[PDB]
């Protein structure tokens, strides 16, 4: 006794991430209502009734999503506790698509059928069997790391002119061979206080370094695995999924801390993004390198924040404690390398360029007029904990001419194509020029300094610096 109105359960297990499940009927059961004849398939559907192949299943899904294949009906199926169940009316064949998982996972298509000839059995030459299928998905990821920084407890810190080395690794989506959207697309953009170096971009794949040519082609073993382009203060890099052989490339690049580096809480972040398809049988692979795609495309992301601080102090008369203008000070790192030169303002105050966590030294180069030179070195420790001052407040002026250095001062770093590098980040090239500080501008009169929270950005010396009046 067949009907029709015979029911059987079509079931999907291993549903993670809470996707939408849609069933598209691609095969109608044809009855005489008491005898089962065969399946009638939607126009454009092609499959092997003996055992449909992955190629065929994905192909059908592609057609459904373009509209080339019109299913006989579309069903929305609820989920719970990792499974979905649908009560089919009569022998019938469906493609299930799982889309929009909130954890970012991407799923393969599923073929489900209710059949009188055994679970899933499509050959038609009493009892209506259902079908249970285990859903299959992949969860991409992207992880960004930075080195070249100085650890301040759990904060990575840096200084003006430091070169920072970033690295990306990622886990690929798993796409079936016939998928129409195999987007594999990587982006980063550096915040404005870091100057991205596109020429530093490297790609390793299968333990081999890529050569990136002039037009952006990422070449390994005479194979183009992707194309890179410099965009704003960063890059877009679109890979060719099939060329990767399911092995993820590893991406590295550098940036150098510039004078716009933010001090304190906000820090200096990047934002690495990995775009892929979470509905790979819909649309087309995205590879436009001018502009990253909008989110059948979704993404994972990662960011590293790097911090800087600034050193401040006040210059006063040793007896009256009244503030002294125009005192010139050097600020040195722990090994006595000159970091910066500052001049005190009307209110006695000076502030350094951006520094990493660490110990520094403040030493006078020129007394204020009417005062004897203070020959003492003043030490100060800079870190998240000591940077409790918030100021309402530089762009240093360099020369490569040693004889134009203020106060006959030493070299503070290097210049290459307009960019400042610290001594410890001395870059390569035959046109790398010595950098000296040519002049110093005092801080604007009426700049305030208020004691405040950790990470405010400014480390103000505990005791003001005395000068002894000549008289
Ligand atoms: Ca369920």
From Swiss-Prot:
Q: Which residues form a coiled coil?
A: none
Pfam families, per database record? Gram_pos_anchor (PF00746), GramPos_pilinBB (PF16569), SpaA (PF17802), T6_Ig_like (PF18002)
**PROSITE patterns in the record:** GRAM_POS_ANCHORING
Q: Where found in the cell?
A: Secreted, Cell wall
Show the InterPro entries listed in the entry: GramPos_pilinBB (IPR032334), Ig-like_fold (IPR013783), LPXTG_anchor (IPR019931), SpaA_PFL_dom_1 (IPR041033), T6_Ig-like (IPR041184)
Membrane topology, record value: Peptidoglycan-anchor
Q: Where is this region: Hydrophilic?
A: 283-301
Q: Name one GO cellular component term.
A: extracellular region
Q: What is its main location?
A: secreted
Q: Which UniProt keywords apply?
A: Cell wall, Peptidoglycan-anchor, Secreted, Signal
The source's domain of life comes to Bacteria
Query: Anything further noted?
Result: More than 25 serologically different T antigens are found to be expressed independently of M protein, but certain T proteins occur only in association with specific M serotypes (i.e. T6 protein is always found on M6 streptococcal strains). The T protein is exposed on the cell surface when fibrillar M protein is enzymatically removed.
Q: What is this protein called?
A: Trypsin-resistant surface T6 protein
Organism (species): Streptococcus pyogenes serotype M6 (strain ATCC BAA-946 / MGAS10394)
Q: What is the lineage of its organism?
A: Bacteria, Bacillati, Bacillota, Bacilli, Lactobacillales
């Amino acid at each position: 006794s067949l009907s029709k109105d015979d029911t059987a359960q079509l079931k999907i297990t291993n549903i993670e991430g809470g996707p939408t499940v849609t069933l598209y009927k691609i095969g109608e059961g044809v009855y005489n209502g008491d005898s089962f004849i065969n399946f009638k398939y939607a126009e454009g559907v092609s499959l092997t009734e003996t055992g449909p192949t992955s190629q065929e299943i994905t192909t059908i899904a592609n057609g459904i999503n373009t509209g080339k294949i019109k299913p006989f009906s579309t069903e929305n199926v609820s989920i719970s506790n990792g499974t979905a169940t649908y009560n089919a009316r009569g022998a019938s064949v469906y493609i299930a698509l799982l889309t929009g998982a909130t954890d970012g996972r991407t799923y393969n298509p599923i073929l489900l059928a209710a059949s009188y000839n055994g679970e899933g059995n499509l050959v038609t030459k009493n009892y209506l069997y259902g079908q249970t299928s285990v859903a299959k998905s992949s969860l991409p990821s992207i992880t960004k790391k930075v080195t070249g920084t100085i650890d301040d407890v759990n904060k990575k810190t840096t200084s003006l002119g430091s070169v920072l080395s970033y690295s990306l690794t990622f886990e690929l989506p798993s796409y079936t061979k016939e998928a129409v959207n195999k987007t594999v697309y990587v982006s980063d953009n550096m915040s404005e206080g870091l100057t991205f170096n596109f020429n530093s971009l490297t790609v390793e794949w299968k333990g081999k370094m890529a050569n990136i040519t002039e037009d952006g082609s990422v070449m390994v073993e005479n194979t183009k695995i992707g194309i890179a382009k410099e965009v704003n203060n960063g890059f877009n890099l679109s890979f060719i999924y099939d060329s990767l052989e399911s092995i993820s490339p590893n991406i590295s690049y550098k940036a150098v801390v510039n004078n716009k580096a933010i001090v304190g809480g906000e820090g200096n972040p990047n934002k690495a993004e990995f775009f892929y398809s979470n509905n790979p049988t819909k649309g087309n692979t995205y590879d436009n390198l001018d502009k990253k795609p909008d989110k059948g495309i979704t993404s994972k992301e990662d960011s590293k924040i790097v911090y800087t601080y600034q050193i401040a102090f006040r210059k006063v008369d040793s007896v009256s404690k009244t503030p002294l203008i125009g005192a010139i000070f050097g600020v040195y790192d722990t090994s006595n390398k000159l970091i910066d030169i500052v001049t005190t303002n009307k209110n006695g105050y000076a502030i350094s360029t951006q520094v990493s966590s660490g110990k520094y030294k403040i030493k006078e180069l020129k007394a204020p007029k009417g005062y004897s030179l203070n020959t003492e070195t003043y030490e100060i420790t800079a870190n998240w904990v000591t940077a409790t001052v918030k100021t309402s407040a530089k762009s240093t002026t360099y020369t490569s001419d040693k004889n134009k250095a203020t106060d006959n001062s030493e070299q503070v770093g290097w210049l290459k194509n307009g960019i400042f590098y610290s001594i410890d980040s001395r870059p390569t090239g035959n046109d790398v020029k010595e950098a000296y500080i040519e002049s110093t501008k005092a801080l604007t009169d009426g700049t305030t300094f208020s004691k405040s929270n950790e990470g405010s950005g400014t480390v103000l010396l505990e005791t003001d610096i005395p000068n002894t009046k000549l008289g």
